[PDB]
């Protein structure tokens, strides 16, 4: 089966899912799996507020996961964990061999090959081919077919491309093999069957974690997919300059992997303002933050610093004031930064 | 063996050497026995528990401790947990095992107890080295 | 005789409640509370 | 598109230039511009030798 769970950011799609699980585990210590899936800087989280059922006091029947863990423990189970595995600075190794007898066979980066950045960005860019479904006879395909540049430099990759899963042939693993090798593991595996899987946290999905995605629809007896957005169409993919264009268009993706294998979908939308009830300012964000004919204080600041250093250090006052006097606590207290590096050794 | 070597489970290093008598020897045993002969079965259980800050730390909210069981099994008497040790041994030596191991059991049967609300009678550990069991 | 006497005086000797479990590893493994 | 905008310095568009055709000389992708002392010591030890 398949499920979707879609509202704005605010509303307790995530909460949900929590409260779910821990009602299914309250019902069945030990019945068919409960798989969360959930990206890697979340699953920490996860781990912990599931534990956190005075009741119960943790899972065993529910298992937080990512794509990697997740593909670490079905390939411990069906194989081919044996094989020895590679890191970014290895490949990078190996392609910097690779560039040293192929130097000559360039079209492009014959000159560029000599400087030891290039290695590090073909490296990033064969990472790239493998997370995108793209074996080297496709980039043959596509340098068979600033057009010059472009096939020439796609030639180049070729080259590197295909000597290196030549090299890797019958002996490695490289470090996007993982969920390919996922993907078509997971049908002939039996903890699978009748297992609850939950997707939560992403905003979009590789295509190589689209087809591990799609084999969880099929094998899987139910699944369920939270998305931030709000009311996204699953005819159309979301104009480019709307707000949830990312969510949106994964929303619209799934929809013809679920309707091609043909498995009934149900529907989930949430209206409440579950997390700024309290306040009046922070209800207001999410549903018009994107409107253009924008409607117009106690717990929205916006602050102005002479710098990052008085930025931090009035942070600091205020954090402090938050649990001295609104009795607030550290772990509630959140800091974003777009750039971190501005901030992490003053911080 | 020759399945999990085919699957690439297993390493051919990892294949060539091993001891087939301590496999056929647990599947002897009186624990094992029991295991072959019961109602329920389960092995490599991950399990998270949430256990309060005094009972680890002395002075003064829950910390997470994870694991994974070996197995469990289930007859009509209750439910019983195993775990594989291969640790070296070849009587005196007994004591000093059930410490060793004493406050990871407890800490087995404290997360079966409380997250799956039943309750654990009797554990036993297999050595692999002369295919001992002592229970707990 | 000044007007914030008492507020100075009382956040210079404030301690944080939860001060001992905010260097307390949350996840844990069998081996570790075991050497503890 | 205003944020993506060409409004640049001759040398901050020099640089997206550089960074975009870097193979077309002998230059690597991930150059870093030095300090006007840091080059300057440069120049001063091959001056040097």
Not at chain 1, 90 to 107: D, P
Not at chain 1, 191 to 198: E, N, P, Q, T
Not at chain 2, 72 to 86: I, R, V
Request: hydrophobic share 35%; glycine share 6%.
């Amino acid at each position: 089966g398949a499920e979707f769970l879609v509202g704005r950011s605010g509303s307790g799609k995530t909460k949900l899912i929590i409260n779910s699980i821990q009602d299914e585990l309250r019902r069945a210590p030990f019945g068919k799996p409960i798989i969360f899936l959930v990206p890697d800087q979340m699953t920490f989280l996860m781990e912990y507020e599931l534990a956190k059922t005075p009741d119960m006091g943790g899972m065993i029947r529910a298992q937080v996961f990512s794509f990697s863990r997740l593909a670490w423990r079905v390939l411990q189970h069906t194989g081919g964990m044996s094989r020895p595995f590679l890191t970014s600075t290895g490949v990078q190794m190996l392609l910097r061999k690779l560039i040293e007898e192929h130097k000559q066979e360039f079209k492009v980066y014959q000159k560029a090959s000599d400087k030891s950045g290039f290695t590090a960005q073909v490296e990033r860019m064969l990472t790239e081919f493998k997370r995108y479904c793209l074996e080297p006879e496709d980039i043959r395909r596509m340098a068979e077919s600033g057009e010059r540049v472009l096939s020439e430099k796609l030639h180049d990759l070729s080259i590197l491309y295909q000597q290196m899963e030549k090299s890797l042939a019958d002996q490695y693993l490289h470090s996007e093999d993982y969920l390919t090798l996922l993907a078509e593991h997971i049908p002939l595996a039996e903890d699978i069957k009748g297992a609850h899987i939950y997707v939560d946290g992403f905003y979009q999905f590789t295509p190589q974690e689209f087809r591990v995605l799609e084999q969880l629809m099929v094998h899987a007896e139910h699944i369920t997919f939270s998305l931030t957005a709000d009311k996204p169409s699953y005819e159309r993919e979301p104009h480019e300059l709307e707000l949830f264009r990312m969510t949106g268009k994964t929303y619209y993706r799934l929809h013809q992997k679920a309707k091609e294998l043909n498995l009934d979908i149900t529907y989930k939308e949430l209206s409440g303002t579950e997390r700024h009830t309290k306040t009046p300012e922070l209800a207001h964000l999410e549903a018009q933050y994107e409107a253009r004919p924008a409607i117009p204080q106690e717990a929205l600041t916006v602050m102005q610093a002479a710098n990052r250093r008085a930025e931090l250090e009035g942070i600091a006052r205020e954090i402090h004031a938050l649990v001295r006097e609104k009795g607030y606590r550290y772990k509630d207290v959140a800091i974003l930064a777009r750039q971190p590096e501005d901030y992490k050794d003053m911080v | 063996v020759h399945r999990l070597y085919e699957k690439e489970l297993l390493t051919e290093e990892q294949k060539d050497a091993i001891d087939i008598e301590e496999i056929v020897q647990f599947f002897h045993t009186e624990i094992g026995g029991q295991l072959i002969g019961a109602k329920w079965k389960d092995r490599e259980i991950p399990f998270s528990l949430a256990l309060p800050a005094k009972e680890i730390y002395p002075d003064a909210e829950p910390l997470l401790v994870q694991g994974i069981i070996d197995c469990l099994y289930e007859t009509e008497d209750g439910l019983y947990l195993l775990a594989y040790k291969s640790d070296r041994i070849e009587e005196g030596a007994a004591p000093i095992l059930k410490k060793r191991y004493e406050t990871q059991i407890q800490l087995y049967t404290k997360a079966v107890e409380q997250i799956a609300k039943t309750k654990v009678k009797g554990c036993a550990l297999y050595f692999f080295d002369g295919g001992h069991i002592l229970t707990l | 005789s000044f007007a914030f006497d008492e507020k100075a005086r009382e956040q210079l000797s404030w301690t944080y409640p939860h001060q001992e479990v905010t260097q307390i590893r949350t996840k844990q493994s069998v081996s570790e509370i075991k050497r503890k | 598109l205003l944020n993506r905008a060409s409004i640049s310095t001759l040398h901050s568009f020099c640089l997206q230039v550089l960074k975009k055709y870097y193979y077309l000389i002998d230059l690597d992708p991930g150059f870093r511009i030095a300090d006007q002392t840091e080059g300057e010591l440069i120049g001063d030890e091959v001056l040097d030798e």
